[PDB]
Design a protein around this ligand. Structure first.
Ligand code: NA
Length: 620
């Protein structure tokens, strides 16, 4: 700089250090975002200290040279426009203007979260944060308490954990965490940026890094001559634009990125289904389409996916979730070539999954197609695959509704089965037992058929007349609650099911006791509660005489029936017995009485019932 005294006088330049220039940027950012009125969830920045100490701030990470490497506004409640000063922080690896964490009172950015120069292991953990919080679920949860207790007691089985998945309340959708109304173009200068997160902001799509915050600023004027490009952000792999209610389209900078891998665009319900389909298509058609690996696009208005030819381009895709969208009809396909590790299409109105929808990685644990309008189980799996999935959720669909067929009769390829341990087919319209799951040799250890239209499981349903199937010996849990079952078959005896542990036939129409599953030496629990016919009459009057001879049986639920005379004395090994609401029962509990008094027994009964051998029960 020069001055006048006419005479030109050169003013010695203040050769200010970069880490100091960063701190003047931090203070300018704080000033622009109404920093004096910030108040953290679970603090504020403070500039009432020496200039070289201005790097020491909650939500800010520095390096050994004192340069800003991370900046998070999470929970501060920032209000204003992100100034062009942001472009000074060129050593920035992580940046958060908001996140999905703010909706669940969690800081995603920090030394234990998304941090500059973190381990690949920490990066993965953090990448999976949205998944563990809002998407992951165990489909075995829909098993009855009886069946879940038997699974949890079995050392040879993975116990079923209590549900931890959060579902957003429509109060939270569009609920702002900040009042950021503009984001400067200057972010294109941060060529070292690895993670860029924003969420719960009222800004519009065109004000997200399209223009200078103020084109007459010292920063804008400088960077104007720098030819900044989105192509130069070679390290930006994780981007999130979450729950921004005033978005009507996705910000255009996303398709301009060269190496984006994770994209979280969930809760943008201001964006029409058509517009989001078009923005997704645009991403697949751009060079970044080939790079994307994770898509979080739940809580949106999608009516369908982009065209198959655009989807096919996303070769690196491995995770897709579309929870709570408006997906209708037959879905466009990605192809077998695209291998998914996660897939969750629950809570839509999907009627068909195409033959070539996708492939799968050997790391697949759980998949979900729950809460849709599926007419059939999609033939996109292989029972012959070596990698066995944990569980697949097909609950709350319309499977078996079309002429009682559980599998597309117009499928040219015969059903290849499913390489999964657990199948959840509860709340459907299944009237015919899905035998083809077993004939193809699916390694099923548990099946949930609760809430269907079954009236009987006849003679050859789990086997062929003179031959058993390869893996039916694995089936240890059968949930058949809420059906209209009157009969089973010898398919349930130890000859076909030698390792059966739990069976729940509660809420069915048996009048004759299905004794066949009692042949198992491994059976731990049996449920046959509330047996009723169409007219509401209590059909089960027969006690399973001989059940005290089940060597492993410890829980019997036969309550709310019309059980009469019980000849055998109840044995102490049946430590959980529900006989409650059986007003005409006649049972001798002589042997279980000292166990009752010791608090070592669990009996559900009425003092009005004809119970013999236990005075301690206060029988009226
Ligand atoms: Na906030």
């Amino acid at each position: 700089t020069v001055k006048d005294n006419d005479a030109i006088v050169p003013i010695k330049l203040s050769r200010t250090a970069e880490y100091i220039k960063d701190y003047l940027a931090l203070k300018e950012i704080w000033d622009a975002l109404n920093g004096k009125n910030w108040s953290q969830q679970g603090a504020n920045w403070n500039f009432n200290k020496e200039l070289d100490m201005w790097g020491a701030q909650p939500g800010v990470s520095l390096n050994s040279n004192g340069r800003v490497t991370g900046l998070s506004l999470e929970g501060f409640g920032a209000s204003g426009r992100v100034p062009d000063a942001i472009g000074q922080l060129t050593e920035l690896e992580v940046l958060a203007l908001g996140s999905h964490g703010e909706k669940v009172n969690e800081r995603l950015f920090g030394p234990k979260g998304i941090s500059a120069n973190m381990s690949d292991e920490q990066k993965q953990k953090m990448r999976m944060h949205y998944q563990k919080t809002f998407v992951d679920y165990d489909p075995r949860e829909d098993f009855s308490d009886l069946i879940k207790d038997c699974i949890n007691s079995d050392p040879q089985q993975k116990s079923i954990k209590k549900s931890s998945r959060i579902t957003l309340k429509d109060t939270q959708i569009g609920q702002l965490s900040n009042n950021i109304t503009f984001v400067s173009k200057a972010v294109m200068r941060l060529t070292k940026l690895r993670q860029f997160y924003m969420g719960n902001s009222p800004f519009v799509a065109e004000n997200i890094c399209e223009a200078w915050e103020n084109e007459n600023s010292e920063y804008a004027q400088q960077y104007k001559t720098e030819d900044l490009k989105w192509d130069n952000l070679k390290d930006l792999t994780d981007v999130e634009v979450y729950n921004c209610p005033n978005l009507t389209k996705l910000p255009t900078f996303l398709k301009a990125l060269p190496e984006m891998q994770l994209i979280n665009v969930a809760c943008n319900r201001g964006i029409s289904g058509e517009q989001l389909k078009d923005d997704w298509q645009a991403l697949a058609d751009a060079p970044v389409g080939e790079k994307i690996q994770i898509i979080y696009i739940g809580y949106n208005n999608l009516k369908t996916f982009p065209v198959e030819t655009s989807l096919q381009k996303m070769k690196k895709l491995g995770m897709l979730e579309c929870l709570y969208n408006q997906l209708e009809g037959k879905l466009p396909a990605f192809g077998s070539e695209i291998k998914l590790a996660s897939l969750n299409l629950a809570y839509n109105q999907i009627t068909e999954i195409p033959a070539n929808f996708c492939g799968f990685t050997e790391q697949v644990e759980n998949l979900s197609f729950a809460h849709n309008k599926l007419k059939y189980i999609p033939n996109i799996f292989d029972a012959k695959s070596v990698s066995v999935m944990s569980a697949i959720d097909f609950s709350y669909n319309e499977i078996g509704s079309v002429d009682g067929k559980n599998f597309d009769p117009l499928d040219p390829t015969p059903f290849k089965g499913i390489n999964v341990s657990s199948i959840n087919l509860s709340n459907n319209q299944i009237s015919k037992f899905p035998k083809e799951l077993f004939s193809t040799g699916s390694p099923l250890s548990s099946i949930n058929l609760m809430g269907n239209m079954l009236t009987e499981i006849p003679k050859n349903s789990l086997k062929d007349e003179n031959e058993n199937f390869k893996n039916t010996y694995l089936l240890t849990s059968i949930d058949l609650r809420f059906n209209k079952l009157t009969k089973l078959s010898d398919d349930f005896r130890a000859t076909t099911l030698p390792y059966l542990v739990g069976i729940d036939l509660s809420y069915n129409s048996f009048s004759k006791f299905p004794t066949q599953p009692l042949n198992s030496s491994t059976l731990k629990g049996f449920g046959i509660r509330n047996q009723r016919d169409a007219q509401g009459n209590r059909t089960l009057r027969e006690w399973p005489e001989g059940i005290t001879l089940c060597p492993s049986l410890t829980q019997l639920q036969i309550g709310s029936n019309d059980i009469r005379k019980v000849n055998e004395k109840i044995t102490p090994n049946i430590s959980v017995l529900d006989i409650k609401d059986n007003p005409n029962i006649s049972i001798d509990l002589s042997y279980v009485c000292p166990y009752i008094e010791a608090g070592m027994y669990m009996l559900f009964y009425d003092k009005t019932q004809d119970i013999r051998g236990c005075d301690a029960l206060d029988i009226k």
